Design a binder for this molecule. Structure first.
Ligand SMILES: [Zn+2]
Ligand SMILES: [Zn+2]
Ligand SMILES: [Zn+2]
Ligand SMILES: [Zn+2]
Lengths: 110, 110
């Protein structure tokens, strides 16, 4: 399952506890159609990769600070992180690419 | 000669332009003794096989994304690729094996 981020200090802690794991952060809002469509597949991947991947979820309406720090301008946006380093940024609704990007490292509103 | 990779999109383009050729990617860093020793022999082979083999070079300190995607954990590491497929992975400093592996398909830091 996908862990909601309450604030920047929550997220900063999660990034350190993730250790060597792949971290994937999903920026979403409740008013975003494409966000809702891809969300089941993201939860499916989180179970398949639970030993290797940590999956975080940032609600942009309550987290303006985290959104500005990651330069999020569109939704959905998935940031792939390992060791506090941003490896790759991915915007859009292709859930087949999302699943592929998750295995290699283990439509658009606003 | 050996072509430096600037990013993942650079590398992805190189993999397609290489066509049917053998591609060899060398993962290295400036702080890696064994990397520096084998490097002349790699350049020698690149000239001998210039019509058949494309030789790419990825600096791991500036390319965390490519390193994670190829699961690089040590140096030097040579990935042998043909058609976007990874045929073989080779870690270590034996330049005689490197030359042999190059002809069949045409010490350790971190
Ligand atoms: Zn569950
Ligand atoms: Zn030359
Ligand atoms: Zn990547
Ligand atoms: Zn082979």
């Amino acid at each position: 399952m996908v862990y909601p981020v309450r604030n920047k200090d929550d997220l900063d802690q999660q990034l350190i506890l993730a250790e060597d794991k792949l971290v994937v952060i999903d920026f979403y809002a409740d008013w975003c159609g494409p966000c809702k469509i891809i969300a089941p597949k993201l939860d499916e991947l989180a179970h398949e990769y639970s030993d290797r991947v940590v999956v975080l979820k940032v609600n942009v309406d309550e987290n303006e600070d985290i959104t500005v720090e990651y330069n999020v301008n569109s939704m959905p946006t998935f940031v792939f992180i390992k060791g506090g380093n941003v490896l790759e940024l991915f915007v859009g609704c292709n859930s087949d690419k999302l699943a592929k990007l998750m295995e290699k490292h283990a439509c658009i509103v606003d």
